[PDB]
Amino acid sequence: VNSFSGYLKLTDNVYIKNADIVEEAKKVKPTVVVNAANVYLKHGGGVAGALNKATNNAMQVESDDYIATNGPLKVGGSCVLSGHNLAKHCLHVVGPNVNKGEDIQLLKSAYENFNQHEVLLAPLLSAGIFGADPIHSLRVCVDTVRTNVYLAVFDKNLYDKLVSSFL
Ligand SMILES: Nc1ncn(CCC[C@H]2CCOC2)c2ncnc1-2
Ligand SMILES: Nc1ncn(CCC[C@H]2CCOC2)c2ncnc1-2
């Protein structure tokens, strides 16, 4: 049993809810919240900007030190950092950004990072300002992630479309 509430079950391991990933993290304090990161961990907008704002910029300060030591992530890669006031840990995952011309085949590699964690609260990778089709992102998630993932879909309109169209 876990603390996640109000989710619709899509498969054995994937659950979905119309929710802002930030308010959900604040309520649950999950072991792992996933950030929709870029390779520079520059948390300007989208899910990353919202998560970072909720940490009072502490996520960005920690991230700048990580990049100064390690250099940029790979598209499709990840790193584990603090979850600050939102979660125990934040898994920063880089999905391909279609609005920068990155290979959408890298979306599967991105979701494979989730398999290193038994339970996660996550957004749909490469959705929103990363420019991918969220229906596609949900299909790759279901077909790639084997651990238990609780997806927070911000847009109510999109949430209803994802559920209604799910095979
Ligand atoms: N502000 C900064 N940003 C980036 N780097 C590169 C770090 C690369 C890693 C990779 C292997 O070990 C070092 C910096 N070095 C010093 N200051 C830096
Ligand atoms: N605070 C937040 N800001 C942005 N997004 C992503 C918005 C993109 C669309 C497409 C997939 O889901 C919504 C969030 N998702 C959950 N919480 C979020």
Q: Quick one: which ligand is closest to 25's CA?
A: 2
Pocket test of ligand 1: the residue of 69, 70, 79 to mutate, having most ligand atoms within 8 Å of its CB, is 69
- From which experimental method does this structure derive? X-ray
Number of other residues whose CB lies within 10 A of the CB of residue 162: 23
- Which residues does residue 33 pair with via DSSP β-bridges, in sequence order? 90, 121
Decide: 155 in ligand 2 pocket, CB within 6 A. yes
Q: What is the DSSP string of the chain?
A: --S--SPEE-SSSEEEEE--HHHHHHHH--SEEEEE--TT----SHHHHHHHHHTTTHHHHHHHHHHHHH-PPPTT-EEEEE-TTT-SEEEEE----GGGT--TTHHHHHHHGGGGSSEEEEPPTT-GGG---HHHHHHHHHHH--SEEEEEE--HHHHHHHHHT--
Resolution for the entry shown, Å: 1.0
The pocket around ligand 1, CB under 6 angstroms, is made up of: 67-71
